[PDB]
RNA sequence: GCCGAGGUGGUGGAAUUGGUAGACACGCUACCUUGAGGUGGUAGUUUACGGGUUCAAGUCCCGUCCUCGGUACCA
RNA sequence: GGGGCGGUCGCCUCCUAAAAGGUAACGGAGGCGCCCAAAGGUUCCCUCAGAAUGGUUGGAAAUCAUUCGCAGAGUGUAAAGGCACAAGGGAGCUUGACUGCGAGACCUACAAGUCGAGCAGGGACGAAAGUCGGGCUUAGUGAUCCGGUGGUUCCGCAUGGA
């Protein structure tokens, strides 16, 4: 016996895009290097960090990276020099 | 001009010693008068907006705003925009002039006039006149009237409770 | 010169030879008297497209 | 105030057919009125004409 | 009821819009402006140290004016701002119009400081 | 419908730019001032 | 239950978004003609439903109900 | 989960997915093959939905004021993430929906894809600071070959052209 029903309708899925931390806390980091790939602003730019057009957080200068917090319930990437 | 002097001289000592305020600034003042129009045929009558852009400029020379709908309603066949209703806000000298027009000249011409309602206060100290015939004060001119669309007047005091706005508006001259 | 009598209560609808009687730069929306809803459609816009 | 938008306002010497005059500021320079407040009969207590007229029929037995 | 929020509440909000984009850094101190009814006030603030470096107000019994709330009072206090900013040599400064327009007494302050030699 | 638009220069006549526009919301020939690298300045361009 | 098809006036039924209680042929009603019927002549009655889109909806779209048929348990 | 039928073939979002990232199945849900000359840029402004009352025709619900509403609304569009210092709303002025680039990064077999401070040239808005290389981020698309069009101190089968 094999009675026919088909049509899953749910095959497809998009390609995994690699959001999240690309560099860590206390990591030495050159200029222009992507610190955080995200959608929206799960984490904000702080000192010496810029937010991109695809709202990635990248470092503007050389220096270590710190994920501090924006006070209430909110985070922040900031790059400091040595 | 005359209603300001009436208000100050007669009303402010009388109302101040009637409600026993702890300062001269607690005495309620009529701050603003908002004239709603509420023409909802802008959807169905595309010209009709000029009606009460024509009329409310003559009702008070401050031109009303052609105000827009802020939310789409499917039962009324209406998307966000397609502007609905006119609106005058009023503070200055023309407003005591406008209550001078209402109290002494207009409100006789309500063709079925009685005590306009005691129960038209919100519970905070503000009042609205619900008008059904748009010609009450003599400027409106039956000659220039086809659409009968009435009016909502919102007399807004600075009163903190309600019955002292009652005793304000009775003493200004609104009958009830 | 003489006498031209016509009915006072007759509604004479006139058509001209010359096309110089338009309230120009107006929309046909504002031109044609379309009162409410189907007055655009059932009266007017059907009458145009049809 | 915006210029060129609003119509004018002069000191309206509002009259009435009962002769009572009053002063406002309106679009009209002078306003003629047919019935003012002090002319309207509801404000003047129990009126003459309509209260003398509005007597319902006193069951006209008389004859 | 009808209640209105203060000038100061909306002014602090309209100032806090301004504050997201300029701060009192090193060698560009923040030149702040407060606009009382009876006086006008102007500080030159480091926001890294939290310290105002120079200051000038029309609440100064020395070098007084008559009207104190006029645009000329604002011009005199702006040249006093720049004069104290010349005595302690910052020489380059960033203008914080604080939640106002760039129109009247604030523009009089700013034009006076630009004339007297603060490079905005 | 949406159409691909070239925007040719007037001082140089060179094409240099493409963006899109409607044939209905912009039925007329559209013009902008952009940068002409042959002219090395801002120049009024023109749909062609 | 699944798939495919159609749901209009008493009837069968056309209508590519543009005026239909019905436009087309029958019934049906009122009258006329005739001794009285029939034929014949004159005039007359919301698109299965509910909610949109639209200036306009039978039509375009989302859901519900019914009927034809194919595809199953069982006899 | 034999083959055919049905269904699918590329791209985006969520869950599966096991608190980095990744991850399969004919697993569960959805979208895309665009739109916008303002729905872009900048400057200046400013705050939402509902409820309770007062209100003709106005209706349960248009528009009005009025208090309470740090968030349901709105965000062109699925869904996630995000947003009231606005990214959500207005108005003015505008074309940066620029040219040559680009230190350095993420991603990835490759082909590709994404982010990019800054520099110079020319501008827009702004008093200035500054911001602007499209939109709130991620979809809205396809190699090469062969042809078309436009331009070019390129070559051009001896030389000048073609």
């Amino acid at each position: 016996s094999k009675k026919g029903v088909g049509s899953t309708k749910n095959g497809r899925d998009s390609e995994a895009k690699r959001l999240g931390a690309k560099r860590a806390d206390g990591q030495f980091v050159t200029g222009g290097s992507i610190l955080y790939r995200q959608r929206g602003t799960k984490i904000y730019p702080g000192e010496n960090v810029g937010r991109g057009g695809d709202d990635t957080l990248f470092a503007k200068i050389d220096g270590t990276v710190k994920f501090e917090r924006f006070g209430r319930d909110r985070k922040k990437v900031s790059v400091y020099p040595v | 001009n005359r209603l300001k002097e009436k208000y100050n001289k007669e009303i402010a000592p009388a109302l101040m010693t009637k409600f026993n305020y702890d300062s001269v600034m607690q005495v309620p003042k009529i701050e603003k008068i908002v004239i709603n129009m509420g023409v909802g045929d802008a959807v169905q009558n595309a010209k009709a907006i000029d009606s009460a852009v024509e009329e409310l400029t003559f009702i008070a020379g401050q031109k009303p705003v052609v105000t827009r709908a802020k939310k789409s309603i499917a039962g009324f066949r209406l998307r966000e925009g397609m502007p609905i209703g006119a609106k005058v806000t009023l503070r200055g000298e023309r407003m005591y002039d406008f209550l001078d027009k209402l109290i002494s000249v207009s409100l006789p011409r309500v063709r079925d006039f009685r005590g306009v309602s005691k129960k038209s206060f919100d519970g905070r100290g503000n009042y609205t006149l619900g008008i059904k015939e748009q010609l009450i004060f003599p400027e409106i001119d039956y000659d220039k009237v086809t659409k009968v669309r009435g009016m909502d007047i919102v007399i807004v005091t600075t009163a903190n409770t309600d019955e002292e706005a009652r005793e304000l508006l009775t003493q200004v001259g609104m009958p009830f | 010169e003489g006498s031209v009598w016509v009915s006072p209560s007759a509604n004479i609808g006139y058509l001209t030879q010359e096309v110089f009687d338009l309230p120009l730069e107006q929309t046909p929306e504002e031109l044609f008297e379309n009162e409410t809803f189907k007055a655009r459609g059932h009266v007017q816009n059907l009458m145009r497209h049809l | 105030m915006k210029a060129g938008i609003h119509p004018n306002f002069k000191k309206a010497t509002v009259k009435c057919a009962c002769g009572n005059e009053f002063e406002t500021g309106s679009v009209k320079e002078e306003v003629r009125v047919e019935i003012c407040s002090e002319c309207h009969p509801f404000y003047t207590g129990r009126q003459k004409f309509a209260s003398a007229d509005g007597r319902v029929d006193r069951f006209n037995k008389k004859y | 009821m009808i209640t209105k929020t203060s000038k100061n509440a909306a002014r602090l909000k309209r100032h806090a819009r301004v504050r997201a984009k300029l701060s009192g850094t090193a060698e560009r101190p923040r030149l702040n402006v407060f606009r009382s009814n009876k006086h006008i006030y102007a500080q030159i603030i480091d926001d890294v140290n939290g310290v105002t470096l120079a200051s000038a107000s029309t609440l100064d019994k020395d070098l007084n004016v008559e009207s104190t709330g006029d645009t000329s009072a604002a011009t005199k206090v702006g040249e006093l701002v720049a004069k104290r900013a010349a005595e302690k040599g910052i020489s380059d400064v960033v203008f914080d119009r604080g939640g106002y327009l760039y129109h009247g007494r604030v523009k009089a302050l700013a034009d006076a400081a630009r004339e007297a030699g603060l490079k905005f | 419908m949406r159409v691909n638009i070239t925007l040719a220069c007037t001082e140089c006549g060179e094409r240099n730019y493409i963006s899109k526009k409607n044939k209905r919301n912009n039925p007329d020939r559209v013009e902008f001032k952009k940068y002409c690298p042959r002219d090395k300045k801002s120049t009024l361009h023109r749909e062609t």
Side-chain angles (χ1 to χ4, degrees):
Chain A
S1 295
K2 199 263 185 67
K3 289 184 283 185
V5 177
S7 299
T8 70
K9 199 67 69 68
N10 286 318
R12 69 271 183 194
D13 189 0
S14 66
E15 202 266 332
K17 288 180 175 291
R18 271 66 182 295
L19 304 182
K22 302 297 184 287
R23 300 292 178 184
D25 193 353
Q27 175 80 262
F28 184 74
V29 155
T30 63
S33 65
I34 295 173
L35 296 171
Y36 198 82
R37 290 279 193 180
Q38 60 187 353
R39 295 295 182 265
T41 171
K42 182 180 280 188
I43 296 172
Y44 281 87
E47 295 184 355
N48 297 314
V49 173
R51 183 175 66 184
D54 199 356
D55 64 18
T56 66
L57 299 174
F58 65 98
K60 289 188 178 182
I61 65 167
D62 304 342
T64 63
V65 176
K66 304 299 292 182
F67 286 84
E68 298 291 329
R69 61 115 186 274
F70 260 112
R72 177 74 267 177
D73 46 355
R74 195 178 291 263
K75 295 185 186 295
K76 171 175 69 177
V77 186
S78 59
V79 169
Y80 295 98
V82 174
Chain B
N1 194 5
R2 182 255 182 84
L3 211 283
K4 279 89 169 179
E5 186 174 1
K6 182 187 286 186
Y7 174 69
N8 290 319
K9 287 188 177 184
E10 300 295 323
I11 304 304
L15 203 152
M16 185 267 176
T17 60
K18 186 175 181 179
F19 293 102
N20 291 317
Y21 299 109
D22 287 333
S23 64
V24 182
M25 294 300 290
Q26 288 183 358
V27 177
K29 296 184 180 182
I30 169 172
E31 176 169 351
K32 67 184 184 183
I33 293 173
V34 177
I35 298 171
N36 191 10
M37 189 65 194
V39 281
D41 294 334
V43 174
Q44 191 179 4
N45 190 1
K47 182 180 177 60
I49 284 300
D50 200 0
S51 179
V53 170
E54 180 174 358
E55 187 195 9
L56 286 177
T57 46
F58 287 121
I59 285 177
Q62 303 180 352
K63 181 179 77 174
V65 169
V66 185
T67 59
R68 296 176 179 178
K70 67 183 71 175
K71 188 181 284 187
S72 57
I73 297 167
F76 290 154
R77 276 79 58 89
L78 182 271
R79 283 186 178 176
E80 179 176 359
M82 292 296 174
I84 292 171
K87 171 185 174 178
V88 189
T89 56
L90 286 175
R91 84 192 55 84
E93 293 182 356
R94 301 183 182 181
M95 303 70 187
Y96 293 90
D97 289 334
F98 182 75
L99 288 184
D100 283 329
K101 288 184 180 178
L102 284 180
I103 291 166
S104 65
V105 181
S106 89
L107 290 177
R109 297 286 206 274
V110 175
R111 187 290 282 168
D112 50 353
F113 186 77
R114 288 179 180 177
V116 71
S117 177
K118 285 94 160 65
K119 294 168 69 175
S120 293
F121 284 91
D122 56 351
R124 302 288 185 181
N126 294 318
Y127 185 80
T128 61
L129 282 173
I131 285 166
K132 82 281 288 178
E133 287 172 349
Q134 74 183 4
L135 41 167
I136 308 176
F137 59 96
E139 197 276 338
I140 308 299
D141 293 331
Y142 289 93
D143 311 332
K144 299 189 266 77
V145 171
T146 64
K147 190 176 181 181
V148 298
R149 186 66 74 204
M151 190 167 71
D152 292 334
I153 294 173
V154 186
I155 296 168
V156 187
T157 62
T158 57
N160 296 112
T161 55
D162 199 2
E163 293 293 325
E164 38 98 15
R166 166 78 66 193
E167 299 297 325
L168 187 145
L169 288 175
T170 55
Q171 288 180 357
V172 176
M174 290 300 295
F176 290 98
Chain C
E1 181 72 30
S3 71
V4 175
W5 179 73
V6 76
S7 295
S9 176
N11 189 1
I12 298 169
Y14 187 72
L15 190 73
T16 75
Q17 180 184 9
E18 61 271 14
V19 284
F20 195 70
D21 273 331
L22 204 281
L24 285 172
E25 290 291 330
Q26 283 187 357
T27 62
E29 186 176 3
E30 184 175 359
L31 178 66
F32 287 99
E33 298 295 324
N34 42 2
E35 198 253 333
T36 50
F37 269 146
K38 303 176 182 179
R40 294 183 72 233
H42 180 270
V43 170
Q44 176 59 251
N45 210 161
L46 172 273
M47 198 68 210
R48 294 189 198 179
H49 185 276
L50 190 263
Chain D
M1 301 300 288
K2 285 283 189 66
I5 289 175
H6 306 294
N8 290 317
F9 275 87
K10 289 186 180 179
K11 188 180 289 185
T13 65
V14 168
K15 293 181 181 180
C16 185
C18 69
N20 286 319
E21 295 177 356
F22 189 72
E23 294 175 353
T24 61
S26 68
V27 172
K28 286 184 180 179
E29 296 186 358
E30 296 183 356
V31 177
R32 288 183 179 178
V33 172
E34 301 172 355
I35 298 166
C36 69
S37 66
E38 293 178 354
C39 183
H40 192 272
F42 185 77
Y43 294 93
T44 62
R46 288 184 183 273
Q47 55 195 353
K48 189 261 187 294
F49 170 70
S51 291
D53 199 5
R55 60 175 176 87
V56 76
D57 49 351
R58 53 168 69 96
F59 48 94
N60 299 113
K61 184 179 182 294
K62 295 181 181 178
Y63 60 93
Chain E
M1 282 294 290
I2 179 172
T3 62
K4 71 275 195 181
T5 56
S6 66
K7 270 79 166 181
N8 196 7
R11 200 266 305 165
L12 285 175
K13 295 298 287 185
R14 278 319 157 274
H15 178 264
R17 185 185 305 117
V18 170
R19 286 294 300 163
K21 65 183 74 174
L22 82 179
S23 179
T25 63
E27 69 263 12
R28 283 182 178 270
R30 181 261 301 260
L31 199 152
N32 198 346
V33 168
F34 179 69
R35 198 184 184 94
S36 179
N37 297 119
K38 290 183 181 179
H39 292 281
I40 197 169
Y41 305 91
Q43 300 181 2
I44 297 172
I45 310 171
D46 291 333
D47 291 326
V48 177
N49 290 318
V51 181
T52 74
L53 297 176
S55 297
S57 64
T58 54
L59 188 139
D60 279 334
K61 76 275 285 181
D62 51 350
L63 283 82
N64 55 358
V65 297
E66 179 69 29
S67 297
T68 315
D70 198 359
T71 186
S72 67
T75 304
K76 264 62 185 298
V77 70
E79 75 181 1
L80 289 178
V81 165
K83 191 67 180 291
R84 298 291 184 268
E87 185 68 29
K88 181 64 179 174
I90 55 98
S91 298
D92 280 324
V93 73
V94 173
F95 187 74
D96 187 3
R97 56 99 186 170
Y100 301 114
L101 282 176
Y102 188 77
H103 179 68
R105 292 184 287 175
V106 174
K107 185 179 185 295
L109 273 160
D111 285 333
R114 289 178 187 270
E115 287 174 353
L118 285 176
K119 278 80 176 61
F120 289 166
Chain F
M1 288 299 295
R2 181 57 59 90
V3 181
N4 293 317
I5 295 301
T6 65
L7 292 170
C9 172
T10 60
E11 290 289 326
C12 189
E14 194 192 11
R15 293 183 188 271
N16 301 114
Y17 286 99
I18 275 186
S19 68
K20 293 181 181 180
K21 78 173 183 66
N22 282 306
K23 188 59 69 180
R24 293 183 184 272
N25 289 326
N26 288 314
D28 290 332
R29 179 174 288 174
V30 76
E31 56 177 356
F32 301 105
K33 55 184 75 172
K34 294 278 186 181
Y35 180 78
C36 288
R38 281 182 64 187
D39 299 332
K40 290 178 186 174
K41 67 185 76 174
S42 63
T43 309
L44 195 278
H45 287 83
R46 177 72 68 186
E47 173 190 359
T48 51

